[PDB]
Design a protein around this ligand. Sequence first.
Ligand SMILES: *[C@@H]1O[C@H](CO)[C@@H](O)[C@H](O)[C@H]1NC(C)=O
Lengths: 137, 39, 171, 50, 198, 50
Amino acid sequence: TRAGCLIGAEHVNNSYECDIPIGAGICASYQTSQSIIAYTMSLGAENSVAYSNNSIAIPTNFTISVTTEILPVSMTKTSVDCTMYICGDSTECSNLLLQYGSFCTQLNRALTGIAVEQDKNTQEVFAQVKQIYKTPP
Amino acid sequence: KFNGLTVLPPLLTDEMIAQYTSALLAGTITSGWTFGAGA
Amino acid sequence: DSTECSNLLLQYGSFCTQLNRALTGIAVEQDKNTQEVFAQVKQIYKTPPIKDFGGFNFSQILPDPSKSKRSFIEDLLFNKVTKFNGLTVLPPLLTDEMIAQYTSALLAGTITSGWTFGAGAALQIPFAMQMAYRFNGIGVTQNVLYENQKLIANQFNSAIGKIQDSLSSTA
Amino acid sequence: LTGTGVLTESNKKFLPFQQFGRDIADTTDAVRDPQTLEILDITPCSFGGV
Amino acid sequence: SALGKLQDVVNQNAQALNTLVKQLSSNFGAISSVLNDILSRLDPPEAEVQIDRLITGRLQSLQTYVTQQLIRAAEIRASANLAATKMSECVLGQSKRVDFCGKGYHLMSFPQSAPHGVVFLHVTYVPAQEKNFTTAPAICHDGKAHFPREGVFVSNGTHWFVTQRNFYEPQIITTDNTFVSGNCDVVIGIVNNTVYDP
Amino acid sequence: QIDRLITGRLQSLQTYVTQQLIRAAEIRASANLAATKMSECVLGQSKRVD
Ligand SMILES: *[C@@H]1O[C@H](CO)[C@@H](O)[C@H](O)[C@H]1NC(C)=O
């Protein structure tokens, strides 16, 4: 292929929707006794709209679809003890580490910044209503 | 979780989140959009 | 190619796995980006052979079969833009011909069906009337267009020509 | 093996020859008492912010 | 497999934590990955070197972890701003931004909570089944042109009607559905007909 | 000597990978913007000024 050396798959002349992407337009799929085929994916059923200069198409009926959309809003608030992480309960290590300065403290400050930004995120997304309404019985 | 690896709890608990979303849904159902512009 | 070096490096842990995983995340997100930008049309529409568009001339942007089935301005753009150590460069999943097919589909849809082809099934409608709707959307009654159709055609054509010149001349 | 913890009588069932127990992140969590064969847990004694 | 986004966030954080922990069991070029063990085996002069190596290694791993977390938190904040915008413009009101609130004309939406994230139900309206009518931009009645007020002129080959753009519902062409202008001369493709008058 | 060379090359590699992470975040921002602009500006007519 134009991607590499494919080993173990038949080469079809057809073209179907891409099931497993490979690269450079090649897609492989498990089909009919069956085996693995590698084709050049097709982009969809071509279609020629019956255009003219005086013909218009108007709908007559309608459908009420209901789609879904999922969004992430917040990570998990993690904190990391500087000392107990690197050399938990080893005085020699603490006294050696003191020579590197404020690096660990800096990292702690960063992780607290993140841990507060999370609650700000959730607060901003949900708490947009002033009162707490209630449906009628 | 054993080496200073603490996992703090979230300030808003799932019950309060559910209450928030029930409020928005009841508002939209009974009042349209007007509840986002005022009363 | 140094076994001693590899065996020494093994003492540092999973750094290789970490870096490889990061770069693989990036390498897949790229194709996800291109997929999300272009692959928004369900079918692959096609313009009719005749070109009765109230007097407008789209030959400068519609494809021509005489090549890389790209268009003129796509050509101007593609021309105005000009290993031993694991440095592999993966190939992009969508090749330029398929990108060109996507954009030709969107363009033919916009020309022959207005916005309706983005809300469901494409419904054809004469271009002059489509521009009438587009006008009436910005608070200018239709009769202005219907009375000034040829002048608007000439202005649009001349503007397309100026775009060709600007791109072909400065880069 | 060494280490600091709070040893408590467990209910895990080792094999007759096993000695340790480990977690998904490969940390010791249960030790068989080499004198009286009772399997103890290991809980790292409490720390935390103020 | 619809909740891949949230499941992915959880998995990413779990793997980051597990890599951070398993970095504790590496030697970084020292003798043994345990501190107390070297503290017993070696005297302070050499315990200093072994320690210093372990400290350099663990500190580098920790900085790498914190940078990964900073970047991923910036991305999550981007997605959170997007969710806030979508709830404020798509629930608390009806929007006219195409495909911003689900494929089709937008009617309303309802939110639903979910562990670390939100889930919208975009209620949309989709036109269904069409007919090939014959049209014309305007009509001549008395030499003067007649354009439709809010609609479009269709014709089933036999008669003419004015109908709204999105739902075939033909109406007789009164002098109220339309408004007059100019004459027959200038518009292209006009058709003779009779506009009734109430 | 090796250990020195390894430390150096590893640090350089991490620096490169961090540069790439940041630049890819920026390009993904611009790609989301392009997707929004195509969906609202081609597939329909917009009224958002400029
Ligand atoms: C539409 O095209 C046909 C093709 O010959 C032509 O006869 C007719 O006059 C055209 N109609 C308009 C309104 O331009």
